[PDB]
Amino acid sequence: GSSGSSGQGTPKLKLKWKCKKEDESKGGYSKDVLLRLLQKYGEVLNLVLSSKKPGTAVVEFATVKAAELAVQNEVGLVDNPLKISWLEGQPQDASGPSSG
Protein backbone atom coordinates (compact mmCIF):
# COMPACT_ATOMS: atom_id res chain seq x y z
CA GLY A 1 0.00 0.00 0.00
CA SER A 2 1.51 3.27 1.20
CA SER A 3 3.91 3.54 4.13
CA GLY A 4 6.80 5.78 5.16
CA SER A 5 7.05 7.02 8.74
CA SER A 6 10.40 8.00 10.25
CA GLY A 7 9.18 8.37 13.83
CA GLN A 8 12.52 9.26 15.39
CA GLY A 9 11.50 11.40 18.35
CA THR A 10 9.54 10.16 21.35
CA PRO A 11 6.63 7.83 20.47
CA LYS A 12 3.80 10.36 20.60
CA LEU A 13 0.22 9.06 20.56
CA LYS A 14 -3.08 10.66 19.54
CA LEU A 15 -6.08 10.38 21.86
CA LYS A 16 -9.44 10.83 20.14
CA TRP A 17 -12.90 10.23 21.61
CA LYS A 18 -16.53 10.79 20.64
CA CYS A 19 -17.57 14.32 21.58
CA LYS A 20 -20.63 16.45 20.83
CA LYS A 21 -20.51 19.56 18.65
CA GLU A 22 -18.92 22.75 19.99
CA ASP A 23 -20.39 22.49 23.49
CA GLU A 24 -19.40 23.35 27.06
CA SER A 25 -19.51 19.63 27.85
CA LYS A 26 -16.33 17.62 27.27
CA GLY A 27 -17.92 14.18 27.19
CA GLY A 28 -16.25 11.94 29.74
CA TYR A 29 -12.54 12.74 29.98
CA SER A 30 -9.99 15.45 30.77
CA LYS A 31 -6.28 16.24 30.52
CA ASP A 32 -6.03 14.89 34.07
CA VAL A 33 -8.09 11.71 33.74
CA LEU A 34 -6.16 10.82 30.58
CA LEU A 35 -2.89 11.86 32.22
CA ARG A 36 -3.42 9.54 35.20
CA LEU A 37 -4.64 6.81 32.85
CA LEU A 38 -1.30 6.79 31.03
CA GLN A 39 0.93 7.76 33.96
CA LYS A 40 0.38 4.31 35.46
CA TYR A 41 1.71 2.77 32.25
CA GLY A 42 4.37 5.36 31.49
CA GLU A 43 5.49 8.86 32.43
CA VAL A 44 3.65 11.48 30.37
CA LEU A 45 6.37 13.98 29.44
CA ASN A 46 3.91 16.18 27.57
CA LEU A 47 0.14 15.99 27.11
CA VAL A 48 -1.43 18.40 24.62
CA LEU A 49 -5.03 18.59 23.42
CA SER A 50 -6.48 19.34 19.99
CA SER A 51 -8.80 22.35 19.85
CA LYS A 52 -9.45 22.27 16.11
CA LYS A 53 -11.74 19.26 16.50
CA PRO A 54 -13.71 18.19 19.60
CA GLY A 55 -12.66 15.01 21.38
CA THR A 56 -9.09 15.03 20.09
CA ALA A 57 -5.67 15.23 21.75
CA VAL A 58 -2.06 14.05 21.59
CA VAL A 59 0.06 12.57 24.39
CA GLU A 60 3.85 12.34 24.54
CA PHE A 61 5.46 9.28 26.11
CA ALA A 62 9.08 8.76 27.17
CA THR A 63 9.39 5.09 26.24
CA VAL A 64 8.01 2.75 23.57
CA LYS A 65 6.97 0.03 26.02
CA ALA A 66 4.57 2.27 27.94
CA ALA A 67 3.15 3.78 24.75
CA GLU A 68 2.27 0.37 23.32
CA LEU A 69 0.70 -0.81 26.58
CA ALA A 70 -1.14 2.51 26.64
CA VAL A 71 -2.47 1.81 23.15
CA GLN A 72 -3.44 -1.81 23.78
CA ASN A 73 -4.42 -2.17 27.44
CA GLU A 74 -5.67 1.31 28.35
CA VAL A 75 -8.80 1.79 26.24
CA GLY A 76 -10.42 4.50 28.33
CA LEU A 77 -13.85 3.54 29.64
CA VAL A 78 -16.07 0.55 28.89
CA ASP A 79 -18.92 2.90 27.97
CA ASN A 80 -16.56 5.05 25.90
CA PRO A 81 -13.51 3.11 24.63
CA LEU A 82 -11.04 5.91 23.91
CA LYS A 83 -9.52 5.84 20.42
CA ILE A 84 -5.75 5.69 20.92
CA SER A 85 -4.06 5.71 17.51
CA TRP A 86 -0.39 5.94 16.54
CA LEU A 87 0.02 9.39 14.99
CA GLU A 88 3.66 8.69 14.14
CA GLY A 89 6.36 6.18 15.03
CA GLN A 90 4.51 2.88 15.32
CA PRO A 91 6.27 -0.30 16.53
CA GLN A 92 6.64 -3.12 14.02
CA ASP A 93 8.19 -6.53 14.68
CA ALA A 94 7.45 -10.16 13.78
CA SER A 95 8.23 -13.45 15.52
CA GLY A 96 9.52 -15.23 12.43
CA PRO A 97 11.78 -15.16 9.36
CA SER A 98 10.93 -12.12 7.23
CA SER A 99 11.19 -11.99 3.44
CA GLY A 100 10.10 -10.18 0.29
Nearest to 38 by CA among 65, 9, 17: 65
Q: Which domains does the chain have, with CATH numbers?
A: 1-100 (3.30.70.330)
Total count of residues recorded for the chain: 100
Full DSSP string of 19-86: --SS-S---S--HHHHHHHHHTTS-EEEEEEESSSSSEEEEEES-HHHHHHHHHT--B-SSSB-EEE-
User: Is 84:44 a contact under the CB 8 Å cutoff?
Assistant: no
